[PDB]
Amino acid sequence: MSRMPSSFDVTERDLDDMTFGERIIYHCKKQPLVPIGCLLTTGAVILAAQNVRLGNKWKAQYYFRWRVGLQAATLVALVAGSFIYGTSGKELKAKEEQLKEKAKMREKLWIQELERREEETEARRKRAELARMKTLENEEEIKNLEKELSDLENKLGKK
């Protein structure tokens, strides 16, 4: 035991970072790329599906989140085709609210279920070593890639 998942700051910003990846897409619309654009769009969710495949494969009993996992999964396919359509831009803000209400509803600050004791005894070992914030690190990793867009101006040598 040297270094394992120990960065547990009870922070509910997982979905916050995920939703942020959709807002940045607006900038991509301004200057869409073919070779890099495809790798950016495809590679964006490529890492999110890996984290969901690891967290799902490793379960203690049942995963109720799977239900909503598909509901939102299909939403990305409908919003992808609705983007080109151009129904309503304001709808984005209205749809965002719906998700906001789900976050508060799901979050229970009154009652919490905690029966599995053995499961806690397993994850405590990793939390007893040390962590370097993997999620946060990835957030900075994508920020660096965005800098290339602004740096491109100097790269070409026009402005």
Add this chain to the structure above:
Amino acid sequence: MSRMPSSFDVTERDLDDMTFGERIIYHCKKQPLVPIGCLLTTGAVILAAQNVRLGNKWKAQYYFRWRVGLQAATLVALVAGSFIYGTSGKELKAKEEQLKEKAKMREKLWIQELERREEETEARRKRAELARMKTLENEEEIKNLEKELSDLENKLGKK
């Protein structure tokens, strides 16, 4: 008072919430109005400023937090001059980047919150009653304000 649970949750994203106020500025950047801009900027900064003013009124303890506080007040004012200047674009990005790095640098394993006997007993009552988060709840108000700005675009004749 000892028997007065006011809630003192030590959140890691406490300052981050205030930092979000800079991100919303981009929305106003698109054709900023004088009348609405005054109440929008001043009306938003006053919320966070009030929190600092409250501590300034009644403190009589520690003089380090006040030192960094002054630096922040001058920083937010300095960026204003850069906005109207429009000389260095990447500079603005680096300015905010340094702030993020500072937070991570400050966070250390050696230096931690020294819990005293009085603090321990106070925490018990604080949690026993309830832990309210006005800073986070008030942050939600900005979402509604931003939505109004989006409507202005439609009024002009875009969507």
